[PDB]
Design a protein around this nucleic acid. Sequence first.
RNA 1: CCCCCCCACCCACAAAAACCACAACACCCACAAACCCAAAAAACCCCACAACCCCCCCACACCCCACCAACCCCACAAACCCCACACACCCCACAAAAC
Length: 200
Amino acid sequence: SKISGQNTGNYKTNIADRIEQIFETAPFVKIVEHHTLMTTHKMCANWSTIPNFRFLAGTYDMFFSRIEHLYSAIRVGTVVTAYEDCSGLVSFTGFIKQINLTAREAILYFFHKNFEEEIRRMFEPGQETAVPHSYFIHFRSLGLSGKSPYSSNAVGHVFNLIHFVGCYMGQVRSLNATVIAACAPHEMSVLGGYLGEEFF
RNA sequence: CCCCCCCACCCACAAAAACCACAACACCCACAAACCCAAAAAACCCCACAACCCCCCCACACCCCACCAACCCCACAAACCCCACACACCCCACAAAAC
């Protein structure tokens, strides 16, 4: 339900086939034969919006991440729930690791007034951004949430800068990420150009 | 058109690796005599009856020119963006998102 968009048909079928083969082979047994999953998805495309359905998926993913299980393969549906709507924060942490910076040092390179609000927004204390298996990883899926201050839009300038540097270094993930048009992409690209020059 | 965890060469038993090896061998050489897919002789332009030798010609003629009026595959007028009701005007937008 989440993976809806332009030109994603062959790809939805491929993930669905991977899903079906997982659940048709041991420790799971084939109960729906083939192509049933795609057809139910056609009628169940907006099931992601349903709050209880999202809540349960997140709960399942939290349980399977901490405890290893025979049916741990169920996580393949619920993996999307982890770090949901926190792409900004996820992009930042990868950027720190790919660039080989201490995160603090990385923020020093953000030479613009606009980054200030975003830096405060994503680094607010008291949220378990520092705990390995906390409710935070599934916070959006679970009830304890609001619009995420960690989403690529909430931290639009930082997100743009990160992937613009990623594009300069040829990171495919950044090449295919969708740019936040509101948050001054042109200025972000210029700064990203210099930073990538330094890091490539 | 990112992700199940662990993981992460479409790496892996042993013994081993020239898609080497019986021996005899090793021109996908060879029967000899011979070794031009030469030769009877006479011949030797796929020359020649002769007249002839433009696939030239009746004459008048000789633009596959011509009735004249003519002669843009111009034209009624009004016209003349294959322009317009307003409202408008990203083939943008629920939210959440957004490898």
